[PDB]
Structures are given as structure tokens and as C-alpha cells.
């Protein structure tokens, strides 16, 4: 109901595992924007990286810290491209509804939050349709979007981010030594090349429409164990560390190092039913 | 104005769950020579879903076989999907990817979407999707819609997918992780050309990773049943 830096920091620290870069970027971006009564541009975040490693999870933490109900708040709107925008040829129908929905909800609530999940599966033309709402305009058809928040979730860049985490692991460095500039350099060929910089450029000034690119790293065995313990408690089970270790034996990659789980924390909790009635 | 049977009749609290357990047990006799973990994990996974009052996501299973087990794969996968509704005449939605590899991706995406949605809207509770490896790669993005762990279109259904491997035989002792690795490696080989990203309507490795994390909860190997390879699925 009332965002405080301390509460958001505690929620991220207590609950989001193995994402040191994302924690820090989100804490400072979200707190700065919501605490600013006069923002000049809607806060636009792009969360990108490995499947199953916390992008919807941390979207919920953000929403919960701003609004009672979290994703079930009346003022938080989730679009899932693969569910709501599945067929490329229906882009006009999606676009017309999406423009009406965004404009009507910001008209009613300046501090609306819109989350676009699976944006890497969303028609480029449908993304083009929301670009005016992301920009530095004071008014867009008579409505200000400067207090709104846009959160994009995607897998784009996941393999290149993993290449960095692998390099650091092979070199004997700490995961937490990875810096955003390491990620940016690995992605300079793809997510951050000129065509994509072009695509996301402001139409008003010499700036990107995406304020923060928030990378998500692949997870290690120790991270899976942390998550399994939380799920056991939430189900009311007595934790059994032998079952934690066995459930966390997923399929890992590369073939040599076997350091990261193929699917992050997804398809893990299914295995609890093999051990608990 | 209520009638009660004697406690001795043991009338099921959950008729669909009790019928599934009985029919799934009878399947073991029709399909000899399978991994014990296929029956154990398949029963526990589907039972959990049938017993859920408000399931959060559908039950998705992958069965896989080598070429020598191709008829058994088709037969077993159909019967497992049918057993999900053992308490009704209701039968599975049937879709087959065989021969579709060079069909127009958007066309196949629409076909799959409408066959699943219409069936689930009208009372069917399971689908069997044969030869998943043979769909146009982009079309398989529709399975995000059906298999997401939070926002699936239909949460109280089962989706039984099959993958036919390229090798001739699958070792009888193959374990769960090796079986899953085989399927994983075949789908990355079929559905991608490199690790380089593609545009929104096409498959690439990064998009395939999120599909895989939605459909590979349980990947189960299938061995040939000689009589089914010889005579077909006659029951």
C-alpha cells in the first residue's frame, strides 16, 4: 500500500535468490520512480534472461510492494503475449484493444502498472503501438503516462548472459563479481546492437525508451535447493534435506561443467510428489 | 431427503480419481516391459492433478520412444490420455504432428489452437499430441498458451505429448534424466539452426528454452510391446 525502500529491499533480499544484479537495479529504479511525485517519463524496465530464474517472480514482488493485491490489484495489468496475442495475423485486433485498454486505465489511474510477459514472442507491430506511451511526452492524446510503469519480461539474450556466468565460473571468480558492463559487452552483438537501439529509440530526444535492462542469470544447484526449501514450507511439509538434494538433481549444462539447470527452477517442484504424499 | 449408502460400499469421494487409478493400473498389463518409474511417476503426477480442487496448471506429460517403439508410443499415449477421463465416455482430443514439418507455421498454429480450445471448451479434459518433434517449429509457441505454470488457458486438463526419437532403439535401463536429455537434444536440433536469435514469430534457442520449461515436467521412455508393433493398437 505504501512503498518503502526498506520493505522492498527486505522482500528482495529475503526471497529472490541468485540474482544479485537484478536485485540492485530493481531496488533503485522502482524506489526512485515511485518516490518521485513529478517523473518526466514512465519507468520502463526490460527484465531478460534465463527461463525459470525469477522474472515473473520479481514482477510480483514489485507489484505487491506498490499495491495491495499485487498482480491482483485493480491497478496492475498483465498481458501475456503467448496467451493474449497468439496469432501474428490478428495484430490489428490486438492493437486496437490494447490502445483502448492502456488509455482508459491510465485515464482512471495515473500510477497504473503494465506488465508485458513473453515480449520476445510479441509482434513487433504491437510493440510499435505502445511506444508513444513509453516516451518523454508530457501528453499522449491528452493523457499523461509519466507516472505509469511498464515492465517487459523476456528470454532475449539468455544464452549470451549465460556465456558470461560460465566464463566467470570457469575463471574461479565469484558469481557476484559479474557486473552489468560484462553483460552489456556480451550483448553488444544482439540485444544491444544498433538495429535494436534503433528500434527502442525515443521519437522525441536522444534516449532509449527502456530505462533499465535488468539481466537474469542461470541458476546453480545451490539456488535450486534454496527454492525447494521455500516450497516445502509453503506446502506444510517437514523439510527433509535428503529430499532437497535429490529433487535439486535436475538436468544441468554444459556437459562438462554441469553447473546451471536447464530450466532454472521450473519443473522442479513437480518432483516433490515423488517423495511426499 | 438424502440417501446414504452403507460405509461398507466405499463410495468414492472423487469418482474421476478412483476410475483413473483403476484404469491406469489395468494399463500396465496391456503394456508389459516398461520402466517401473513410468508407471510410478505417471500415476503420482496425474493423481495429484485429478485430486486438486483448484489446479493451478494443467498436467503435461511427454512420452518418447525410439523408432522400434513407434506403434507402442502412439497406443500408450492415447490410452493414458483416455484414462484421465476413465469415469466418462469423454475421449481425448487427438492431434498429430506427423508430416507437418513443412506446412505453413501460422496455419498449423491456428489449427492446434482451435482444436485444443474447442475441445476443452466443450467438455473434453485431455489431449494427445503425437509427434511433437514434427510440427513446424514456430507453431509450437502455441504450447506456451496451454502449458504455462500460472496462466494456462485451461488449468484442469491433461496434455499428453509424444516425441519419436531418431535412433532405432532406446536402452531398457535408460533413466529419467538421460531420457529427458535425449528429448531435449532432439527438439533443439529440430527447432533451431544456431543459437542466434530470430524474430518474434519464429523459434530460436532462447524461445525454445521457455517452451521446454513448460512441457518437460515428466519425460517417460517407452519400449516396444511386440504385439502392438505387429498388430497395431487393437484395444
Amino acid at each position, epitope marked *: 500500500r505504501s512503498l518503502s525502500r526498506e520493505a522492498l529491499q527486505k522482500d528482495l533480499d529475503d526471497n529472490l535468490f541468485g540474482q544479485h544484479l537484478a536485485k540492485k537495479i530493481i531496488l533503485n529504479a522502482v524506489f526512485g520512480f515511485i518516490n518521485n511525485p513529478k517523473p518526466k517519463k514512465p519507468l520502463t524496465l526490460s527484465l531478460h534472461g534465463w527461463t525459470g530464474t525469477g522474472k515473473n517472480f520479481v514482477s510480483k514482488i514489485i507489484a505487491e510492494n506498490i499495491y495491495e493485491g499485487g498482480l491482483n490489484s485493480d491497478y496492475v495489468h498483465l498481458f501475456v503475449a503467448t496467451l493474449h496475442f497468439p496469432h501474428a495475423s490478428n*495484430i490489428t485486433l490486438y492493437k486496437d484493444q490494447l490502445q483502448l485498454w492502456i488509455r482508459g486505465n491510465v485515464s482512471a489511474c495515473a500510477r497504473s502498472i503494465f506488465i508485458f510477459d513473453q515480449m520476445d514472442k510479441m509482434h513487433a507491430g504491437l510493440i510499435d503501438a505502445i511506444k508513444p506511451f513509453l516516451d518523454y511526452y508530457d501528453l499522449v492524446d491528452g493523457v499523461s503516462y509519466q507516472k505509469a510503469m511498464f515492465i517487459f519480461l523476456s528470454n532475449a539474450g539468455a544464452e549470451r548472459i549465460t556465456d558470461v556466468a560460465l566464463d566467470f565460473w570457469r575463471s574461479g571468480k565469484q558469481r557476484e563479481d559479474i557486473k552489468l558492463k560484462d553483460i552489456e559487452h556480451a550483448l553488444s552483438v544482439s540485444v544491444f546492437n544498433n538495429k535494436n537501439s534503433g528500434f527502442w529509440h525515443s521519437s522525441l530526444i536522444d534516449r532509449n525508451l527502456i530505462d533499465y535492462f535488468v539481466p537474469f542469470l542461470p541458476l546453480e544447484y545451490k539456488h535450486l535447493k534454496m527454492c525447494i526449501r521455500v516450497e516445502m514450507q509453503s506446502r506444510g511439509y517437514e523439510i527433509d534435506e535428503d529430499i532437497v538434494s535429490r529433487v535439486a538433481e535436475m538436468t544441468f549444462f554444459p556437459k562438462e561443467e554441469r553447473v546451471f539447470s536447464d530450466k532454472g527452477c521450473k519443473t522442479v517442484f513437480t518432483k516433490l510428489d515423488y517423495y511426499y504424499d | 431427503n438424502s440417501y446414504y449408502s452403507s460405509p461398507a460400499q466405499q463410495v468414492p469421494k472423487n469418482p474421476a480419481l478412483e476410475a483413473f487409478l483403476a484404469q491406469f493400473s489395468q494399463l500396465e498389463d496391456k503394456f508389459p516391459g516398461q520402466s517401473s518409474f513410468l508407471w510410478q511417476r505417471g500415476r503420482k503426477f496425474l493423481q495429484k492433478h485429478l485430486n486438486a480442487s483448484n489446479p493451478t496448471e494443467p498436467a503435461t506429460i511427454i512420452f518418447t520412444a525410439a523408432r522400434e517403439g513407434r506403434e507402442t508410443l502412439k497406443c500408450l499415449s492415447h490410452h493414458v490420455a483416455d484414462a484421465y477421463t476413465s469415469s466418462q465416455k469423454v475421449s481425448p482430443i487427438q492431434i498429430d504432428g506427423a508430416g507437418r514439418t513443412w506446412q505453413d507455421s501460422d496455419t498449423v498454429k491456428l489449427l492446434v489452437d482451435l482444436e485444443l480450445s474447442y475441445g476443452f471448451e466443450n467438455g473434453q479434459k485431455a489431449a494427445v499430441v503425437h509427434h511433437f518433434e514434427s510440427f513446424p517449429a514456430g507453431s509450437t509457441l502455441i504450447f506456451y498458451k496451454y502449458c504455462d505454470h500460472e496462466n494456462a488457458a485451461f488449468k484442469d486438463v491433461a496434455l499428453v505429448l509424444t516425441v519419436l526419437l531418431e535412433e532405432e532403439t532406446l536402452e531398457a535401463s535408460v533413466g529419467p534424466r538421460e531420457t529427458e536429455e535425449k528429448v531435449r537434444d532432439l527438439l533443439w536440433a529440430k527447432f533451431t539452426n544456431s543459437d542466434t536469435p530470430t524474430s518474434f514469430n519464429h523459434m530460436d534457442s532462447d524461445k525454445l528454452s521457455g517452451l521446454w520449461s513448460r512441457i518437460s515436467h515428466l519425460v517417460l521412455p517407452v519400449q516396444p510391446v511386440s504385439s502392438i508393433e505387429e498388430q497395431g493398437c487393437l484395444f
Partner: nanobody
Amino acid sequence: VQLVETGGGLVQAGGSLRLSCAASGNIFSFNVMGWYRQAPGKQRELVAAITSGDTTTYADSVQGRFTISRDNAKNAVYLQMNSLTPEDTAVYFCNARRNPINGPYYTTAYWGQGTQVTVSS
């Protein structure tokens, strides 16, 4: 908005028929329009469908022979059926589907009353 089909009747094996459906309201908002058919003692089955942006799909049994088309400006959908055989005998229904872009999945469906198609051998 109501869907009303016309164009049914009897055809000789090898012959052709064109079904039409007029909607009494605008159809631009329908994600998908399509044709289903129901033969004696059988479940209703998809024959053909088309998105608002003109992407089509067909049941395996009619591929090549049938063509669906859609005119958002005339609020109409059509099914051209060529090379008919007795297996195509059925009541044909036009369908329209409307889906949300937010929230839990659902489909608002519209159906016509159906038109009989009978193919003589």
C-alpha cells in the same frame, strides 16, 4: 448480433457448393470465424477457420478442396466447397469467436442455426 447461414442443399459427388454467413453486427472484432459440420450420430468438427487478418486453416479431410474467406466490410464469411463426396454430408454451422486481451482466458462464441448439405453418390 446473429449469424445466419445460407447456401446448403443437395450436390452430386464431384460437384460444388458455396456456403455464406451473414452476421447482423460488425465482425471485425471476431478473432476467428469458421465453419463446423455435424454428421448423423457424430460430434461436431472443425472444417475451416480464418483470422481477422486472413490466415486460414483446414481440417486434414478438406485440404485442397475447400476455401474459407472473410469480408469484415460485408460482415460475411464464406466456404467454397469443391469436389464433394458423400462423406461431406452434414449440417454446417458458422462460428465466431471473440477473446479478451487481458485477464483469464475465455471465449465468447456465436453460432448460426446451421444449413444442411447432402452429397449424393
